[PDB]
Amino acid sequence: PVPSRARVYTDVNTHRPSEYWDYESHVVEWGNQDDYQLVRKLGRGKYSEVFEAINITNNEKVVVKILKPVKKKKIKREIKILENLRGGPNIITLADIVKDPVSRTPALVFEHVNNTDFQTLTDYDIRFYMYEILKALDYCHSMGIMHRDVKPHNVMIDHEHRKLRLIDWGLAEFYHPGQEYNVRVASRYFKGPELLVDYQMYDYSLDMWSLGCMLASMIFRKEPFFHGHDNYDQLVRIAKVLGTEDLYDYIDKYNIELDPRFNDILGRHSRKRWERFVHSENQHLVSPEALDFLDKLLRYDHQSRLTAREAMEHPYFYTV
Amino acid sequence: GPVPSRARVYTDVNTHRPSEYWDYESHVVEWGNQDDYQLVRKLGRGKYSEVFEAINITNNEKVVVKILKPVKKKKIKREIKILENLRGGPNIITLADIVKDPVSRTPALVFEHVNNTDFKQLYQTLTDYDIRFYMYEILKALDYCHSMGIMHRDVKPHNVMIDHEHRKLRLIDWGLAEFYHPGQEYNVRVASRYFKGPELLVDYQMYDYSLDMWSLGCMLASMIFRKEPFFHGHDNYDQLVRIAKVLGTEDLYDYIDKYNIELDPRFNDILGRHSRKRWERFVHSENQHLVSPEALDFLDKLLRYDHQSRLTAREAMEHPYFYTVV
Ligand SMILES: CCc1ccccc1-c1ccc(CNCCc2nc3cc(OC)ccc3[nH]2)cc1Cl
Numbered sequence: 001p002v003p004s005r006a007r008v009y010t011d012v013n014t015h016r017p018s019e020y021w022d023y024e025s026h027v028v029e030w031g032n033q034d035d036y037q038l039v040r041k042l043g044r045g046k047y048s049e050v051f052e053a054i055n056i057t058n059n060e061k062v063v064v065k066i067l068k069p070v071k072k073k074k075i076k077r078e079i080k081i082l083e084n085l086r087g088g089p090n091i092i093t094l095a096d097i098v099k100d101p102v103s104r105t106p107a108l109v110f111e112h113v114n115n116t117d118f119q120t121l122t123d124y125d126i127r128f129y130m131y132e133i134l135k136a137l138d139y140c141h142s143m144g145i146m147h148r149d150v151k152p153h154n155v156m157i158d159h160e161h162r163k164l165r166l167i168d169w170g171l172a173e174f175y176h177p178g179q180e181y182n183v184r185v186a187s188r189y190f191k192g193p194e195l196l197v198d199y200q201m202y203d204y205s206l207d208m209w210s211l212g213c214m215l216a217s218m219i220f221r222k223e224p225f226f227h228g229h230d231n232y233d234q235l236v237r238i239a240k241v242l243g244t245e246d247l248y249d250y251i252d253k254y255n256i257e258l259d260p261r262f263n264d265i266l267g268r269h270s271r272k273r274w275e276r277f278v279h280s281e282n283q284h285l286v287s288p289e290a291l292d293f294l295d296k297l298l299r300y301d302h303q304s305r306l307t308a309r310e311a312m313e314h315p316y317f318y319t320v
Numbered sequence: 321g322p323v324p325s326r327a328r329v330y331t332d333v334n335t336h337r338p339s340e341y342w343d344y345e346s347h348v349v350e351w352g353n354q355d356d357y358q359l360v361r362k363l364g365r366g367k368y369s370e371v372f373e374a375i376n377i378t379n380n381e382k383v384v385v386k387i388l389k390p391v392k393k394k395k396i397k398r399e400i401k402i403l404e405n406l407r408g409g410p411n412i413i414t415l416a417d418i419v420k421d422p423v424s425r426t427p428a429l430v431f432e433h434v435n436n437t438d439f440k441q442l443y444q445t446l447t448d449y450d451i452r453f454y455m456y457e458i459l460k461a462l463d464y465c466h467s468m469g470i471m472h473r474d475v476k477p478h479n480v481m482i483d484h485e486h487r488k489l490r491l492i493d494w495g496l497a498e499f500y501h502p503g504q505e506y507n508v509r510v511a512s513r514y515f516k517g518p519e520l521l522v523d524y525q526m527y528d529y530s531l532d533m534w535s536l537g538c539m540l541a542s543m544i545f546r547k548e549p550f551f552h553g554h555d556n557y558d559q560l561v562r563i564a565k566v567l568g569t570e571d572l573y574d575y576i577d578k579y580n581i582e583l584d585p586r587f588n589d590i591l592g593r594h595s596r597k598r599w600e601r602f603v604h605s606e607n608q609h610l611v612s613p614e615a616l617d618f619l620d621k622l623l624r625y626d627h628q629s630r631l632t633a634r635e636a637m638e639h640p641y642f643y644t645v646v
């Protein structure tokens with residue numbers, strides 16, 4: 001395959017000392033979890049359990065994410081990235097790194113977030129929160145980090161305080177030009193074309209594809225927008241909207257070899273117009289600006305997608 | 321008999337934990353294969369250990385291998401359990417592996433590598449800021465291990481490794497460490513002569529984390545005054561006389577009376593009568609650049625006969641002497 005690199009923040013890690021991006025060499029100081037009393041379980045992840053807790057030293061609520069130590073290297077990676085991004089705009093704030101004295105199970109302690117469930121959402125609300133996610137993305141990309149798991153589940157919102165946080169940095173990675181990354185990242189519905197066609201030299205632009213999937217689901221009230229039933233089928237769902245002509249132009253541009261599992265399922269599909277997804281229940285959220293912005297996000301060619309900084313200057317945000 | 325005493329902080333941390341945490345005799349040690357490590361050079365030798373720099377042949381990383389002379393099996397289980405409990409704590413030496421050589425079957429502990437700077441030459445280059453910085457780093461380790469219900473019981477310069485280039489500090493050699501249980505009567509034959517707290521010297525067995533705070537105080541005094549060691553006893557009885565020559569014999573009697581301690585008759589002919597000295601007395605041309613009212617106030621609050629009056633590690637971290645450190 002043809003090599004590729006990010007159009008923005010290409011060498012931000014290259015120009016930084018190894019201590020910034022060498023997470024394997026990072027020394028983790030595990031404090032005592034006795035300073036936190038667990039209150040209740042909030043939810044479960046594939047390798048984590050999140051709890052609401054109280055910091056007994058200052059009577060403040062916190063969130064404790066207890067990690068199943070399946071891969072030690074991955075825990076070091078998440079901790080290093082969270083430490084590097086700590087305090088960045090709309091990034092979940094790592095407050096402490098602790099282990100229970102008896103269990104010795106790794107646990108991450110974060111700032112509390114009064115997560116609203118979610119209906120009454122306005123056109124302005126979508127622009128507002130989309131801009132808030134872009135602030136987090138332009139910040140983490142500028143810090144040489146790809147989130148690689150952008151989806152609604154990883155965005156916490158406190159609608160009362162108009163506060164948004166990008167969470168779960170467990171799949172995040174440092175961007176190095178020319179690096180070949182594992183494509184088994186992100187959640188099925190939000191996997192970029194690059195992951196599905198097994199193109200390993202991807203970049204921050206993957207997060208922009210995921211953001212586009214979120215936008216399409218909201219404005220069209222179709223969740224998920226690209227509803228694959230497996231990783232191969234996911235690419236077919238994309239092809240049913242974007243067309244198969246541009247998919248071949250993409251794979252040809254990067255000299256990608258298509259897995260033979262696509263042979264019997266891909267078929268032939270026309271490129272659809274975004275206006276076709278507009279209906280009576282969603283028309284109050286759709287506008288020419290929204291469709292133009294969406295069109296500039298959902299592109300097979302990762303290099304042609306808007307960057308988070310370019311996306312922030314789009315007319316769709318002129319009102320925020 | 322003597323008046324009972326308990327720690328002012330972290331009193332019941334082990335009492336409220338399941339026996340698995342502190343019953344080291346029942347702990348099952350999994351001894352791995354030492355073939356993954358090649359010994360490079362000897363770093364130093366302890367009374368019952370030899371510490372080597374080694375290379376982990378599976379990942380080409382340097383490690384530290386402590387080969388223990390298995391004189392007391394229970395003590396090895398204790399050290400292993402404590403190191404396992406504290407594994408990953410701030411400024412605590414990190415146990416990486418537990419191994420036995422296939423032929424020798426000698427117990428060996430494998431730790432994270434530490435680039436130990438020789439301070440015998442950099443003792444002269446240290447600044448007031450450096451002493452406050454490294455003292456704060458030791459207090460992080462102590463407040464952490466105490467919070468984990470562990471007393472180190474051998475706090476001294478030899479058991480503190482510093483990589484000055486990276487401003488990295490590690491509290492090592494947990495061979496004498498013990499689990500704190502309120503009301504437990506401990507062996508007083510712990511720590512190293514110069515660093516022994518008065519509780520040990522007067523054979524008061526019901527001591528606690530505060531013992532480590534006296535030892536830290538001896539280290540602070542030897543550094544800021546450039547007097548190594550600060551309390552230079554020639555035997556364990558004489559060590560108390562050297563402390564009394566500074567702290568005075570009036571406060572020593574107030575201490576033993578408070579806990580109804582019986583003073584060993586071996587003290588009769590050597591203790592004498594001594595005035596309480598002012599800390600400013602130890603200031604001289606060679607060390608004045610390391611001394612300040614804050615430093616002497618902090619030292620005065622560590623070096624107290626009464627173990628209960630000494631600052632805890634958490635109280636010590638909030639002292640004005642540390643206002644200048646992160
Ligand atoms: C209105 C903004 C918006 C624009 C476009 C597309 C979607 C959305 C959106 C819609 C809903 C949500 C809320 N997602 C909830 C996130 C969440 N995981 C959690 C995990 C937990 O424990 C594991 C607990 C609470 C959690 N809470 C976030 C977002 Cl960003």
Ligand SMILES: CCc1ccccc1-c1ccc(CNCCc2nc3cc(OC)ccc3[nH]2)cc1Cl
Pocket residue numbers: 363364365366371436439446450451454455458476477478479480481482539540543
């Ligand atoms: C400025 C730091 C400081 C502030 C206040 C009082 C003392 C000190 C201090 C001064 C020097 C040192 C360094 N000690 C190194 C100890 C050490 N064990 C070793 C064991 C070895 O084999 C078993 C080999 C080398 C070793 N090397 C530590 C400390 Cl904590």
